[PDB]
Amino acid sequence: DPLAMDPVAGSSTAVATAGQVNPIDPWIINNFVQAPQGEFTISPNNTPGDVLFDLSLGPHLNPFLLHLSQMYNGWVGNMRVRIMLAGNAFTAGKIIVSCIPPGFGSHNLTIAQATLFPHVIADVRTLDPIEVPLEDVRNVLFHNNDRNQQTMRLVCMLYTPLRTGGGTGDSFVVAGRVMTCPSPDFNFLFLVPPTVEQKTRPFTLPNLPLSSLSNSRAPLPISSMGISPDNVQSVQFQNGRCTLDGRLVGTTPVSLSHVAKIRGTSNGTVINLTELDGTPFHPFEGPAPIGFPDLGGCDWHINMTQFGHSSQTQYDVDTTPDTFVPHLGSIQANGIGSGNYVGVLSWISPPSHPSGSQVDLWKIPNYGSSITEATHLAPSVYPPGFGEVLVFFMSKMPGPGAYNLPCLLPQEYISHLASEQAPTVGEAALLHYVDPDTGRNLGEFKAYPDGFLTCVPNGASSGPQQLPINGVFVFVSWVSRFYQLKPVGTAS
Amino acid sequence: DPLAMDPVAGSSTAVATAGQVNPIDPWIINNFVQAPQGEFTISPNNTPGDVLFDLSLGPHLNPFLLHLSQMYNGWVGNMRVRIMLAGNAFTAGKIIVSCIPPGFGSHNLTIAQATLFPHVIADVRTLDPIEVPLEDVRNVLFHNNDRNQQTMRLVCMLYTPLRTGGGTGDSFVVAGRVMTCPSPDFNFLFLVPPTVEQKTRPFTLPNLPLSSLSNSRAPLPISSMGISPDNVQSVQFQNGRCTLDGRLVGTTPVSLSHVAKIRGTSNGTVINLTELDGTPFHPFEGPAPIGFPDLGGCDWHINMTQFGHSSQTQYDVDTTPDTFVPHLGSIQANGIGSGNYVGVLSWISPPSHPSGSQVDLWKIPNYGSSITEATHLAPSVYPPGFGEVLVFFMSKMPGPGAYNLPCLLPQEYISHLASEQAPTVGEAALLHYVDPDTGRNLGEFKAYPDGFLTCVPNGASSGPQQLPINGVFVFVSWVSRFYQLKPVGTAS
Amino acid sequence: SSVDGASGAGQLVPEVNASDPLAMDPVAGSSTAVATAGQVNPIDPWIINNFVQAPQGEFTISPNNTPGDVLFDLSLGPHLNPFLLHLSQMYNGWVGNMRVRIMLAGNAFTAGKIIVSCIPPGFGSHNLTIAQATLFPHVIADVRTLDPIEVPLEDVRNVLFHNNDRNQQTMRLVCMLYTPLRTGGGTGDSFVVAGRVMTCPSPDFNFLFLVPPTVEQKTRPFTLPNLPLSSLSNSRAPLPISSMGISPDNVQSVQFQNGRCTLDGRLVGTTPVSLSHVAKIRGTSNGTVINLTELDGTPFHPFEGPAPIGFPDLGGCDWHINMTQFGHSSQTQYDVDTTPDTFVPHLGSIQANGIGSGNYVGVLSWISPPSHPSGSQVDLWKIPNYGSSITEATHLAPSVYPPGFGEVLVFFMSKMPGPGAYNLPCLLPQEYISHLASEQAPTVGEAALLHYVDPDTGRNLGEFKAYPDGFLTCVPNGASSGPQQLPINGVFVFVSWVSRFYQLKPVGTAS
Amino acid sequence: DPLAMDPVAGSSTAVATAGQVNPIDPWIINNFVQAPQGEFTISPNNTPGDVLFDLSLGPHLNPFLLHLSQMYNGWVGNMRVRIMLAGNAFTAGKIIVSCIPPGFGSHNLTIAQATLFPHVIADVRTLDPIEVPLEDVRNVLFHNNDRNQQTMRLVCMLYTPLRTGGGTGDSFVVAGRVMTCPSPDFNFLFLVPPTVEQKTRPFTLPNLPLSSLSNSRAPLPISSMGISPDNVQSVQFQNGRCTLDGRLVGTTPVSLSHVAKIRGTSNGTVINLTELDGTPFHPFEGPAPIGFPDLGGCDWHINMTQFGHSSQTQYDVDTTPDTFVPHLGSIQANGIGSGNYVGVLSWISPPSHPSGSQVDLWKIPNYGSSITEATHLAPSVYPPGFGEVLVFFMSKMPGPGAYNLPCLLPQEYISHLASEQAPTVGEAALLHYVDPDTGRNLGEFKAYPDGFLTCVPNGASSGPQQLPINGVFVFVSWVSRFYQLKPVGTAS
């Protein structure tokens, strides 16, 4: 049935107040395209009430409009949404799509309450799409490019529990797709220099094969993707950490030239640390100097050089003694004279002080417990999704064995995100790992806002380790935190 | 919904420039027939993004039009495509059919981008067909018979992953069919003598039972079809190699009268090779004289005769010594006088020099490593499809055991293709092996452009070896590289 | 919008340009494509009349310029207007005419004339003499003319419309200096005429087919990463940038092999993508000779290049790297002299002055003055001798030199650890390279005008030119002055595409 | 050519919903008045892209309107802007003014980009004033006095370099003046009791000459203005810290009567501090008692007194001891009897504990490093800006040598700011150090919100030290990010 709403006016409001009223190409006007937040999934893992997707009106709901968004600074108009479900005859269920007006705020709604808004309900079996108009309910004359604005939203919820019958293969998920096109009322407003506004920038990942990239914890080329041992779950690296917004975290630097390095003046007993610039490090600033190595379960030794002096020495460091207070810019000097050096991690050994034990590169070293100053550490991470695991980028590390350093994101990705500070829309970013030569999808992954990927392993023996390093990660769509990925690899 | 396109004009453009504007039979005008590239398959082996088929506008999309194509040299007009899917209630999924305008070029598109073109989406379950108009977007007044022209294309992709539920039988594939008919705007242009232009010739295989044909590596009648041992995968024969275009490769000749033969002048120590004509062989020309035997893992001996001399001798040849340099037209003469002879392979023995080992007819002999000249060898082959295996034609070879020579294509097929240099449309040619007496389909195979068949064996014990040699291979349709064949034979 | 100084310009300069009409008939716009294009996409009417500064919006005339010099070469297309350029990325094809307006207005004391000629598609590239330019429909104007000259760029077509490929040849507008520029009065040679080019589409102009917004390369804008210089690194060694520098009066041409990338994103020489491959080598030690391979362990090949990708390119230096190994707890030093006949990087063969057998991964980390020549000075501007394997094509990266009026090469330098105050110069920061490679943006025009700016205040600190081959140039103020006097907080901002001869303003402070 | 803008409505919109629509004195209605930031000069040294001026639509542009805003609580309307240049017929160069809509951002632009906005490009030779309409582009019906309200902006940049001919006197510069005036569209909205609303209050500094004032760190007359040595960059005092909003930060009090003083109970070993009222101090409310001296690298000592006891006892203090826990209200009693006294810093000496070394008044003493509590220190202030340096107010303090005590704001200023809590609009307050008698401007300064001044020193020796202490600081206007100060000091 039709929505319980009266038609909302378009440009007619902002005529005498906006500097310009700019029309759009009529070919976009009714061509239904997949919205950037165009995917979702329903599986028996979902419970009635789960929000499959939450959209908010704006040009960011259509790729074409989005591209134009970077050229104008305002907009007004209504859109049109179309939803599709790829179900089976075995999939019983109903979904509710409700329009939530601005000003209502956020609350936990029971499926019953979700009905109280103009809505549309559909059986997951339908072969045909569902159409819902997204009206531009306004309190103001028009909208500016600002995702802080409260616009009308479309919330899709599981109305009844998904109940698969038959030979119930819990690996079965109903694929959902969202598509939109602007109602002819739609109009952009003020013309503005392209791409300058950041609020309108699309999310982008560099078009470069994984192999040619490097590690973010140590200057090492990536050799393969890996998974944490069944034991490890939460991680807390300090380098190679960046938000999809492009905000650096922990001790993560922009360029590799700062990764896994330290600079300071040796007192022949203790080394006073300084930023690579030579600038004074400050304990409140962070956990340690920017670029300072974060290899935990290790007894690492860096190669130290000096300016104006022909020399190369080895500084063996154990991260256990109380003399190891990087947080206060003071560490040991096992056997180094005075002066200032520049060290680069280039050789790791199994931790000495614990008990002469095994290497656990998944850990983070202890930064002096300086309680008088601000121990501003980088938060931990873990897979929030359905049977997802953290995906790591690994490079073989030189040492007394088969060591391979795991990191969250390649340094180049970090460098890219920092430049294009593209706002993150949605709870997660669905990525498709594609082979550049064929364009075939090798896998499906999810990049979370905090800056880390996850995936679903086909089996304990299976995973991304089995995939070639020629692929490139391509952004496909923004998705919900609870999107269920297709398992990667081959189990046998 | 309707396509996001404006109607494109027909003949009205090329009136004042083409010599003639020729109309077609109105009965063809709206009769939906299966296009020559009328088949495709979707299976869980496919990944969203896979191109199920790629069509390009032209009379070659309709059998009737195609037949007329051989009579005119130009065309203009729009067509109409109709797609069908034979799915189940267990098959969940969606496909995208998009129209790609000329000039766009080729790129790897994510399912999201595929949506940005005028498109049509369908659930794999539909009982009804899908219709899409293929407009003749033109930059020029009209089109000439040239498949190098850039015309509008229709690309079908898997929009969402195919997810079979229930008692998941991975042998289940959704059968797809494409059909077309010309929009009344369609018109052929200049009348031209029939079949003369090659660009318009249909692909054809000789209507002859397999049994009556011969081998392409040795003058032996075909006795059965076979499969490479689980160990063998890639092959590199040099004789019996021809493209579907009709281009001969390696040392492959047109007639059997040149197969497995050699001619040259014996120096009582070394035999200098020449082409069977008597013409001088040239090392840059190829790997060895045209017709020169390619039986690898063998210690073969040919029967040598002479002109103007009553004699028949036996020249036993081991393909291991450094004296074996066919590439330079110089080989051994184990015990032959001087003069010129003509030898025909007629008896093989297990290889002597390796260690007195077993016969491996799947190999190719070593042609002298002449690095100063061009060792122009014929590339290797292997099954590109889903669990496909190379199909071979075998004839029993005379020798000290149960030997059967495997070859890629019967010589007669080669002779045929060479004559009718029919352009290959599509990634592969779907063939149906039919019993001439009943017309019943015995099997389904794929002939690839390079000149070799493949198939899917029902089981390790099953395969084409179990099929009668009375059948004839009939061309059915051009298909994608990733078309999935129905397994052949019977497993028990 | 436009306010020419007519009111107060006295009558020393001509207001409007008096010139004979263009010897050319009007060309049709969209009317052509209407019947065969899949769509005819209209554009925002506000763009239709705004004369905006084209991406190739600047040029300069100076007394150094000689008649015949090309001030700008415009080829018809959406890439001539910033708005259109952005929309280009969304459509496949176009048809229509453009309205061009060149702006001049030199002092009443300057004299000189330029000539603009329209060249038909299909003519090809040829070096035209000023007299040849006359043969094409042209317009001539005095540099003093107040009001901007308007020239219609007609879309001469052989076909119904255009597509976004390289198979297309459109009409061009070449502007050259007609007569030498000469300022009278108290000639301040700092005086050059600053020209501006603005365009807006004629209402005939239309885009054609809607297409996925970014996919096509022809439409991609040239962009530089928005990152302060200090945060970036060197390309010849994994060292952070310290400051910019100039080659000594003596040094002119350079041939670095690492840290070389075309503005289109084409990697040249041994230049790798990531720093993880910079100044490193991998190979198997034979205790006497080390057999090189790519860092991937993959086999190097003499036809591939001068040396393995990432192989250090420091010339006048006696460098020694730090070598490590997998599975073997060790760290050794490899002292290398680039002079010996045993130093044949081009053949994957080098010395081993004291290294046991095995396979290592070395990182340049310590350099010293070249031993073998005469125990003399360090010249980092040089490139080492790559084995002159006569039996293999030594595919080297070409040399670069400043083509502009009194321009010099600009280098990015980082201090290198050694027996003194050394600083390694490179052409581009590694990250810039990484960026260009990703965004293979077509380069339009002979050079890119850049403005070095302080991100905080937005103050223009310097003016530079980036050339296609991948290198910057600038005009140093005094001999003592130059880019070394500038802070490393700035970022490079693309201003407009320019001709080879755009004359830059001297950088730094001379005293 | 015209301006790329449609005219925007004035009061028309307000009428319907504003309570009143108040007219303006017609004499103001079209009288062009110079704007606060109405001056700029174009020297041949400027490069195209340099920003000449920045404007924001608002009553603040016109002193008359401004004075009126304090009587009404809303406004809507359009102003008219006139730019006037002073040049010969012997010059050349163009300027460009771009109209930037509200809701864009403050990111820097290229002259090319400036063209993308509705703009006006004028040639320097123009005689007549350039009129540009400052239109009220609104998102709402009208404006309520808020800082949240973003208005139309006008940015002016040099388009083409100034090239003067003739016997070129490089002292030659083209001066520019900016003037505005409302248009009949403009109207104030609701009559509200004058000066009661905070939002309308103008920023003000006391009209008193520097000399007659005092330091905010110690009760001492200001004797000179100084700058931190090239070595001292970041500063962090705790007294004499006050935001322009009128918010007291750190231990900063209002009256000098609480400056550099402490009151507490002497345990004969440790002194237990309290606020001057005899009220209990609390480690959580702040890092130390309000008024507690913040002199860093100094071995200072007060003169204590007590009520009901005729006594004066010198109390010596070292800021290094672990007994010095000001944050916990516990300090040393190096030789003091028990009781409760009131001490006032009156004599300073070089710090004893470091090594009996020199005095550093730029430093801040150590306030007991308590981890349990929140040592909420007042954040460090550094000079934000290209070449801007921190300005200090100094007074000579008694001790064994020359002790010039630095200060950020004269206490009197602080007292004033708290009284008139004037909201801070903009980034910085342009100030003029004027000689009261002559009414002559002696220097151009910048006042930042956090509570401090900056300036651009002329020569290495030249600066504020070369200025007389008879001047008064006068507020000019709220400046932008782009505003570059005029170098202060007498350089020759």
CSV table of C-alpha atoms in Angstrom, one decimal, chain A residues 27 31-34 63-64 82 84-90 125-127 167 172-173 177 179 436 439-441 474 486, chain B residues 1 4-6 47-50 89-94 108 110-112 115-116 119 121 123 125 159-161 163 166:
chain,number,residue,atom,x,y,z
A,27,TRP,CA,18.7,10.6,-16.9
A,31,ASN,CA,17.5,5.3,-13.2
A,32,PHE,CA,17.6,3.0,-10.2
A,33,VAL,CA,21.2,2.4,-9.2
A,34,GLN,CA,22.8,0.5,-6.3
A,63,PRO,CA,26.6,7.2,-6.6
A,64,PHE,CA,25.8,9.7,-9.3
A,82,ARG,CA,14.0,0.0,-4.0
A,84,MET,CA,15.6,-6.7,-3.3
A,85,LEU,CA,15.9,-10.0,-1.6
A,86,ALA,CA,17.5,-13.1,-3.0
A,87,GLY,CA,15.7,-15.7,-1.0
A,88,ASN,CA,14.8,-19.4,-1.4
A,89,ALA,CA,11.6,-21.4,-1.0
A,90,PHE,CA,13.2,-22.5,2.3
A,125,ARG,CA,10.8,-15.0,-0.7
A,126,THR,CA,9.7,-12.2,-3.2
A,127,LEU,CA,11.3,-12.2,-6.6
A,167,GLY,CA,18.5,-29.6,5.1
A,172,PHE,CA,22.8,-19.8,3.9
A,173,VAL,CA,22.1,-16.1,3.9
A,177,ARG,CA,20.4,-5.0,-2.1
A,179,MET,CA,18.9,0.9,-4.9
A,436,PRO,CA,43.6,-7.4,-11.3
A,439,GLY,CA,38.6,-9.1,-12.3
A,440,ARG,CA,37.3,-12.2,-10.6
A,441,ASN,CA,36.3,-12.0,-6.9
A,474,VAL,CA,38.3,-2.6,-3.8
A,486,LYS,CA,30.9,-15.4,2.5
B,1,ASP,CA,11.2,-1.1,-15.7
B,4,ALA,CA,17.3,4.4,-19.3
B,5,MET,CA,17.8,5.2,-23.0
B,6,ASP,CA,16.2,7.2,-25.8
B,47,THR,CA,31.3,-15.7,-7.9
B,48,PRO,CA,29.3,-12.4,-8.0
B,49,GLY,CA,31.0,-10.4,-10.7
B,50,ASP,CA,31.6,-13.3,-13.0
B,89,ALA,CA,13.1,-23.2,-5.7
B,90,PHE,CA,16.5,-24.0,-4.1
B,91,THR,CA,18.4,-21.6,-6.2
B,92,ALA,CA,18.6,-18.1,-4.7
B,93,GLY,CA,20.3,-15.4,-6.6
B,94,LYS,CA,20.1,-12.3,-8.9
B,108,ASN,CA,36.9,-4.7,-14.3
B,110,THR,CA,32.3,-4.3,-9.4
B,111,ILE,CA,28.7,-5.5,-9.3
B,112,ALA,CA,27.9,-2.0,-8.0
B,115,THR,CA,24.3,-1.1,-12.0
B,116,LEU,CA,25.3,2.3,-13.2
B,119,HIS,CA,20.3,-2.5,-16.7
B,121,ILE,CA,17.9,-7.4,-12.8
B,123,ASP,CA,15.9,-13.4,-9.7
B,125,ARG,CA,13.9,-18.4,-10.0
B,159,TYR,CA,24.7,-9.9,-9.1
B,160,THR,CA,24.6,-11.9,-5.9
B,161,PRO,CA,26.2,-15.2,-4.9
B,163,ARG,CA,23.2,-20.1,-2.9
B,166,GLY,CA,18.6,-28.2,0.8
